[PDB]
Amino acid sequence: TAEEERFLDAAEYGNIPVVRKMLEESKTLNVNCVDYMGQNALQLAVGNEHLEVTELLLKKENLARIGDALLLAISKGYVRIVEAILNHPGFAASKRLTLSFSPDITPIILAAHCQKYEVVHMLLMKGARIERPHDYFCKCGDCMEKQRHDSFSHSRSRINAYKGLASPAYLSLSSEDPVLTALELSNELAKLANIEKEFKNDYRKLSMQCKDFVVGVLDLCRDSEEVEAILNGDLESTRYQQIMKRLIKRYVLKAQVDKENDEVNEGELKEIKQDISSLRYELLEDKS
Amino acid sequence: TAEEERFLDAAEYGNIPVVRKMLEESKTLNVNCVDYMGQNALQLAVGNEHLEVTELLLKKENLARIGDALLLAISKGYVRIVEAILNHPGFAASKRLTLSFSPDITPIILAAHCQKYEVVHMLLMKGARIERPHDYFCKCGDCMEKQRHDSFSHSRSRINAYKGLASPAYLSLSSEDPVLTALELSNELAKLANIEKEFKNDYRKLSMQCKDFVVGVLDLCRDSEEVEAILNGDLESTRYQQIMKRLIKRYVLKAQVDKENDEVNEGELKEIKQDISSLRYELLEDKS
Amino acid sequence: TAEEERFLDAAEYGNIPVVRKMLEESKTLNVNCVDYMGQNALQLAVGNEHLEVTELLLKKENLARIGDALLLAISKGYVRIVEAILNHPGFAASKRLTLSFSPDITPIILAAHCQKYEVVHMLLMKGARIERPHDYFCKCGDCMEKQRHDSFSHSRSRINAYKGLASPAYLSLSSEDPVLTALELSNELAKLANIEKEFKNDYRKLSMQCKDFVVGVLDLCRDSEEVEAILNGDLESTRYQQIMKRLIKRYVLKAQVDKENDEVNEGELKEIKQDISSLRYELLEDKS
Amino acid sequence: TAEEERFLDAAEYGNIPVVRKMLEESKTLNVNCVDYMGQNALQLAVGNEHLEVTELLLKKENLARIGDALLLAISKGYVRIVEAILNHPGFAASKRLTLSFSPDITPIILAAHCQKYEVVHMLLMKGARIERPHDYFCKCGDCMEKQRHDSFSHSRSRINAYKGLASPAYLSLSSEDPVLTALELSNELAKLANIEKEFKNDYRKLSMQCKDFVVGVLDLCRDSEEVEAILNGDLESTRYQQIMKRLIKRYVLKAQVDKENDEVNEGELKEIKQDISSLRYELLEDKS
Incomplete structure (x- = not known):
């Protein structure tokens, strides 16, 4: 777990070419490290660190904590992190019920409890409008x-x-x-x-x-x-x-x-x- | 609108040599991009980013949103941005009524609702004194x-x-x-x-x-x-x-x-x- | 005390290669400088300056103010400074009474007056649990x-x-x-x-x-x-x-x-x- | 006054090698520029900009606004700026009455209205103790x-x-x-x-x-x-x-x-x- 702890120390703070080295060293240990959270992109969406997220988007090894990371980026109120989450891993639809923190709250509703207009407007540019x-x-x-x-x-x-x-x-x-x-x-x-x-x-x-x-x-x-x-x-x-x-x-x-x-x-x-x-x-x- | 979105991403944040590249690439798309505002210097007068404004002053393609950008620079209370707006594109006079946000408020009055002394004194160094x-x-x-x-x-x-x-x-x-x-x-x-x-x-x-x-x-x-x-x-x-x-x-x-x-x-x-x-x-x- | 005052001016602020020079110049004057505090790592744990602390950990000349520096790093609420204090100079045990500010407060109790969860959890990863x-x-x-x-x-x-x-x-x-x-x-x-x-x-x-x-x-x-x-x-x-x-x-x-x-x-x-x-x-x- | 305005724009913000150039260009215009203040070190003691002050200390052309600059550095509560003022231009004594803002307040009293202990202790390291x-x-x-x-x-x-x-x-x-x-x-x-x-x-x-x-x-x-x-x-x-x-x-x-x-x-x-x-x-x- 030594490389895991080095990865988490590179994860809480910036250390962007250190994460580049962790990419280029054959990915010996998966991004599944646990401090209190099960996955690690939750602790990567803490600061205004976009390059970490863009390096995470090239890590498509079914790291299935994209939705809770999106909820953190909305609740803390980032903008371009939300755009990086919405654009590249792809989303078919979000209407009623999927299998992926985690309250029972759709992200339009959680974007509506906060009053951040541009986040909800970027949600409306994609097709999901009405809270039924x-x-x-x-x-x-x-x-x-x-x-x-x-x-x-x-x-x-x-x-x-x-x-x-x-x-x-x-x-x-x-x-x-x-x-x-x-x-x-x-x-x-x-x-x-x-x-x-x-x-x-x-x-x-x-x-x-x-x-x-x-x-x-x-x-x-x-x-x-x-x-x-x-x-x-x-x-x-x-x-x-x-x-x-x-x-x-x-x-x-x-x-x-x-x-x-x-x-x-x-x-x-x-x-x-x-x-x-x-x-x-x-x-x-x-x-x- | 791909170059437009790259320009707006260079516009909300710094990206100053990116805007230099957008200058030097023959100005393929005009500075008329709309997110919620009609023009783009309004979203360029958000932070303390003077070099963006000085590069905008060399863009004299009748980008007629200088007055509302001046009102934003006064209401937020910048100093040298207001100087860069007042000096270089030129102002003949401002007395009663022109054709150029936009409340019905002359900038001395909007500089007088805020109590920022140096802004109103820089207005007084040019010839416009009394609110009639x-x-x-x-x-x-x-x-x-x-x-x-x-x-x-x-x-x-x-x-x-x-x-x-x-x-x-x-x-x-x-x-x-x-x-x-x-x-x-x-x-x-x-x-x-x-x-x-x-x-x-x-x-x-x-x-x-x-x-x-x-x-x-x-x-x-x-x-x-x-x-x-x-x-x-x-x-x-x-x-x-x-x-x-x-x-x-x-x-x-x-x-x-x-x-x-x-x-x-x-x-x-x-x-x-x-x-x-x-x-x-x-x-x-x-x-x- | 001229090198001492240069060292303290390098100590309150960063000056990290200046402290490297003070290391490499044969350690002519010991780290025992007094402004109001007896030792100097207390004034070195003021800001988020980890490299100073890591250079202090190579200074094992019995600079016996590690415990009060740990109490400052806990009371101000640093994380990796507390890790750097706990890991490298070594700790046998902390149960009842030793001979090393200084109230009569064990660091689990002082970490418990503040509500900082990760500090107390890092205390619990080492063996010291119950406040008796x-x-x-x-x-x-x-x-x-x-x-x-x-x-x-x-x-x-x-x-x-x-x-x-x-x-x-x-x-x-x-x-x-x-x-x-x-x-x-x-x-x-x-x-x-x-x-x-x-x-x-x-x-x-x-x-x-x-x-x-x-x-x-x-x-x-x-x-x-x-x-x-x-x-x-x-x-x-x-x-x-x-x-x-x-x-x-x-x-x-x-x-x-x-x-x-x-x-x-x-x-x-x-x-x-x-x-x-x-x-x-x-x-x-x-x-x- | 063009070099004067360039000097003041280098004075309110950092522009430290610009001030080095203003030093090295034979000092064509004296440091006597007026915006609202008579002298310019008052507007140079605004931020935590020590190098400007150290370059001012080599400008000993009887720029007699050191005392009010010291009062600004005490009232705003700087530390090393106060040290740079006290050390290098020299002070014979300060007991009753000299001829050099400006309320009728000795700097120990103005350092005593604020409660900043290290400033008054640095005043006490020099010989001036009691407010009579x-x-x-x-x-x-x-x-x-x-x-x-x-x-x-x-x-x-x-x-x-x-x-x-x-x-x-x-x-x-x-x-x-x-x-x-x-x-x-x-x-x-x-x-x-x-x-x-x-x-x-x-x-x-x-x-x-x-x-x-x-x-x-x-x-x-x-x-x-x-x-x-x-x-x-x-x-x-x-x-x-x-x-x-x-x-x-x-x-x-x-x-x-x-x-x-x-x-x-x-x-x-x-x-x-x-x-x-x-x-x-x-x-x-x-x-x-």
């Missing part, structure tokens, strides 16, 4: 889905799906008229707060998030739409497409500025330290 | 300006102009005796709070900002001016020039220290990461 | 330990030992079933709060920490264990091993994310500055 | 000092001197028994709060700071001194030297850790950016 809003009532038609599992996974996965479908970001993500759809989802979550018991506080939170979302989009304030359908929906609380897209861009830029006015995350500092160490290893080992 | 305090009453003389637009843009642009004219920074920016002018503007904003309805809280905020401004300038405390005109203005709440300029310098230095004792912005961390990546690309691609 | 929970009553059997010292060191070292034994991290550190042991320790600390006077607030704090620990481990929520022994312990407030280890890994990852969502420490910024200066000294002095 | 506690009553003996100036400078300079003499750091700085001297100064500031009117809140603050200082030094808790003189002083609220010095070292280390657990200053981030730009300029201009 079903009935989620006592009767749904998919009674066999209610009969496969009989546990708290139904209600909690329902709440997680509506947290994904809460539209924190869907105004850049739906096709046409996101405000009316946000009003409809607010009414639906209000009715679920009326009906579905013992979890009503979360539905009230999501309904107030949708309300304050619509209020902020109104507070963009370029040109008064003031459609009477919008007014009647408020009672229950083309060039038009061009005005709508311009307001979409305004709200996206304001949301990104309000993201950039936030408190520091310590992991973002750890990213800077690992980038400094990767610079150290690149410059010194290319001098040698 | 007009009557802003029911009657103003410029009734045709009130008749061109008939909307909320009058009142809201008025409030934005008085937020620019609130003097957060004008003590380094006016010509002579900024304290008496601040007292006069505080009296004017008090009278506008008395008269102009449904927005009185903002005028009260700006009046209290002017009052606390004058109180802090009094709290500099080198030599007691104590002019009886200042006393009579407080009732309604040369060597003198040398004392005034020295107090101006004292207040500017105290304001800059109080700026440097503020909470961290995450965009300032992103600037550090992009500077690290620019160092990476410079050193590695100059080794090659 | 004794009776700690009026009668204990070790009455001669109560008669060697007669001071406040008994009660305060007892409280420090139970702060080490509070299980902030022991769910990754004990062998089997940490939740039941946490319940037993919560009951023991509750009884010590009932009995041991004038320090009851700290025992109440540790008992509430154990309670909220067990509540969070319950709030992992994969599969309901719901053992009736757990229920009866709550009244006084194999595949099972596989489920338990998976919940252990879930709680460890959630704890590390909650660590990485914390406020910035200024010493972590100082680490970045000293790493930048080490890069400066490496690159410039290897150009020369 | 005089009577500061209605009668003092130095009545001519009260008759030279007749203004608020007496009371405010008195309060600033007692803020310097508040002992935030003097336990590492006085000769022997700092706790009894802190008790005496607390009694003196209490009596000044009884006597000197209209500023009593600041004296109450400094007295409570001295009280909490003594309480924290008591809360070090190695060995109970419990001198009856300390008890009688509390009523009005050798090996002993070795115990006292060890408690001094304990309190200094605890104070430095509590400094390193503080909120981030944005100027510390600006230091990192200017160090990155200095690395950029060094590496690129040494490639050329």
Whole structure:
């Protein structure tokens, strides 16, 4: 395990030509090393180290921890690492159920809990769009889905799906008229707060998030739409497409500025330290 | 769009000799690439990457997004990027109305919402000084300006102009005796709070900002001016020039220290990461 | 002391080939320099400077400040510096009492006040596991330990030992079933709060920490264990091993994310500055 | 002023061989450039750029802004920049009054408002120790000092001197028994709060700071001194030297850790950016 420990020390920090040497030395030991994680690309997606990931993409020995590495790259919020994962090992489809951390969360939903717009838009450039809003009532038609599992996974996965479908970001993500759809989802979550018991506080939170979302989009304030359908929906609380897209861009830029006015995350500092160490290893080992 | 995507990947991060190669390869594809922004210098003014901007200044193919790039460089608060924008592509004048994001905000006003003194002073070294305090009453003389637009843009642009004219920074920016002018503007904003309805809280905020401004300038405390005109203005709440300029310098230095004792912005961390990546690309691609 | 001051200036910052020159110049002056600390590896374990420590490991001239340097590397929370200290100068055992800052704290306890899991796990890979929970009553059997010292060191070292034994991290550190042991320790600390006077607030704090620990481990929520022994312990407030280890890994990852969502420490910024200066000294002095 | 502006652009950022070229090109224009500051070493002591300062020390053309640059290096809290200022241009003495920003604050007092221990200790290694506690009553003996100036400078300079003499750091700085001297100064500031009117809140603050200082030094808790003189002083609220010095070292280390657990200053981030730009300029201009 000596070469394994050398590989992991080259893995947590940069050591990029050391990993090139581990490539060129006939791959004597497989990339299956365990510290606390079963595989090693999970600990390779820690810092902003793209070249390690590109060298991992040439290691197609069925290293089947690409999905959890993608979930780490989304939850930490990388961009080009997510692109390197999505492009080269290939993906046929991702619709219902495969056999590959690991919560029961599709990566569009996990990209929707965070509000990082470009990650979800890169997910939308590939074909996977809608998080499937079903009935989620006592009767749904998919009674066999209610009969496969009989546990708290139904209600909690329902709440997680509506947290994904809460539209924190869907105004850049739906096709046409996101405000009316946000009003409809607010009414639906209000009715679920009326009906579905013992979890009503979360539905009230999501309904107030949708309300304050619509209020902020109104507070963009370029040109008064003031459609009477919008007014009647408020009672229950083309060039038009061009005005709508311009307001979409305004709200996206304001949301990104309000993201950039936030408190520091310590992991973002750890990213800077690992980038400094990767610079150290690149410059010194290319001098040698 | 393959060269376009290579250009944008060279654009978000440093890749400065890659952009030199894109220059030297006959400019096969124009700099008009769209991710969410129409042009590309907007995404080039993200980090502290001056050499990209200087290479853009040699690209005079009527890439008409210099003004919004200047607004980004002011709102994020760069210094030498603003100098590179102001110097080389040339500016005839900027007084009332041209045809070139984009709120209805002149860059002196947007430099005045932020309190960054050196940016506004570099604006004042060129000829554009005053944000035009007009009557802003029911009657103003410029009734045709009130008749061109008939909307909320009058009142809201008025409030934005008085937020620019609130003097957060004008003590380094006016010509002579900024304290008496601040007292006069505080009296004017008090009278506008008395008269102009449904927005009185903002005028009260700006009046209290002017009052606390004058109180802090009094709290500099080198030599007691104590002019009886200042006393009579407080009732309604040369060597003198040398004392005034020295107090101006004292207040500017105290304001800059109080700026440097503020909470961290995450965009300032992103600037550090992009500077690290620019160092990476410079050193590695100059080794090659 | 001129070479001593040059050595200390090479010691606070990087200057790694300068320290190589101080090695190769026959070691004219010993590494015993005093600014405020008696030895110098204490001021060498400030930044993320591993090569200095590896050059110190070849300096085996009985520089007997390895233990306090290990305590600094644990309290600041380095990883590979702790590995470099533990591996090469050798350690026979660490059980009760040796003759080598310096509080009366064994490094497992000081690694247990901080919650850094990998440091304590690297301590557990070597043979030193348990922090010795004794009776700690009026009668204990070790009455001669109560008669060697007669001071406040008994009660305060007892409280420090139970702060080490509070299980902030022991769910990754004990062998089997940490939740039941946490319940037993919560009951023991509750009884010590009932009995041991004038320090009851700290025992109440540790008992509430154990309670909220067990509540969070319950709030992992994969599969309901719901053992009736757990229920009866709550009244006084194999595949099972596989489920338990998976919940252990879930709680460890959630704890590390909650660590990485914390406020910035200024010493972590100082680490970045000293790493930048080490890069400066490496690159410039290897150009020369 | 073209070479002046090139020099200032080399001055705000690193550009160290550019400043070497400005040295070697016969010094055509003197270092007297004005942006807002009269001299230029004030804007050269912004970042952690030592080589610029060492090149300034070879520029002995009576560039008489060394004292304000020293005050900037102390107030921002550099270490080796302060050493470079103190060592090479020479200092005869600094006792009462010379003719060379600029508040009326001696650098020991300005180093005492900040709590940076090593800066004040480097001041104490040179001969300047005591901030001269005089009577500061209605009668003092130095009545001519009260008759030279007749203004608020007496009371405010008195309060600033007692803020310097508040002992935030003097336990590492006085000769022997700092706790009894802190008790005496607390009694003196209490009596000044009884006597000197209209500023009593600041004296109450400094007295409570001295009280909490003594309480924290008591809360070090190695060995109970419990001198009856300390008890009688509390009523009005050798090996002993070795115990006292060890408690001094304990309190200094605890104070430095509590400094390193503080909120981030944005100027510390600006230091990192200017160090990155200095690395950029060094590496690129040494490639050329």
